[PDB]
Design a protein around this ligand. Structure first.
Ligand SMILES: *[C@H](C)[C@H]1/C(=C/c2[nH]c(/C=C3N=C(/C=C4\NC(=O)C(CC)=C4C)C(C)=C\3CCC(=O)O)c(CCC(=O)O)c2C)NC(=O)[C@@H]1C
Length: 179
């Protein structure tokens, strides 16, 4: 007789082929999502003519890392850098989860009210001006951030509004698609 391979090793291999098809699609989806986020920060940097645009991801214990960045070559890269909770306190992570935004024309202007240690931190990256909008899943997932490094910058309301609208679509992706 015969047919022993059909319901043994050939059907085993067939399940493995179907799972391989599915795992390669899932990895391509991870690549495509990171490409869309990368294209978004690079295009926002070009369109704003900002010196840096990045996506900062916070973990539940409030530590963080830059997951996407576009930076002009005259200024430091935040891509590889991990930071503790103290650079962005959990009390403020909660205010961002509840929709806090900031548009700071001049981080060195005392009336902007920034912690001395925070002014020192943003100085590490040659930051003069910063625009900050949250990405949520509400729990904070991260920040979409624009920096000016060459000069102080009076941010315009539409820049803040449309940065928020981009971050809100990142929030939907990270939530409704469960991506
Ligand atoms: C003190 C030793 C440390 C510290 C304290 C601190 N930070 C904030 C608030 C913020 N910190 C950040 C962090 C960033 N901004 C960026 O552009 C980047 C990427 C380069 C990061 C990581 C942000 C966005 C905020 C929120 C600012 C806001 O007012 O909404 C506070 C609270 C606010 C205040 O100014 O008192 C505090 C106390 N931050 C440091 O970096 C020090 C090491």
């Amino acid at each position: 007789s015969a047919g022993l391979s059909m319901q043994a090793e050939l059907r085993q291999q067939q399940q493995r082929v179907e799972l391989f098809s599915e795992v390669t699609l899932k990895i391509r989806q991870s690549l495509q999502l990171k490409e869309i986020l990368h294209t978004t920060v690079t295009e926002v940097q070009r369109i704003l003519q900002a010196d840096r645009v990045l996506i900062y991801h916070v973990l539940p214990d409030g530590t963080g890392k830059t997951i996407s960045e576009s930076v002009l070559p005259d200024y430091p890269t935040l891509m590889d850098l991990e930071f503790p909770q103290e650079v962005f306190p959990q009390e403020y992570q909660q205010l961002y989860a509840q929709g806090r935004v900031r548009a700071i024309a001049d981080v060195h202007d005392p009336t902007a009210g920034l912690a001395e240690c925070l002014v020192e931190f943003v100085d590490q990256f040659h930051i003069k001006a910063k625009l900050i909008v949250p990405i949520v899943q509400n729990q904070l997932w991260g920040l979409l951030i624009a920096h000016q490094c060459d000069s102080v910058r009076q941010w315009v309301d539409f820049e803040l509004e449309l940065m928020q609208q981009l971050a809100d679509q990142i929030s939907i992706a990270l939530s409704q698609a469960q991506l």
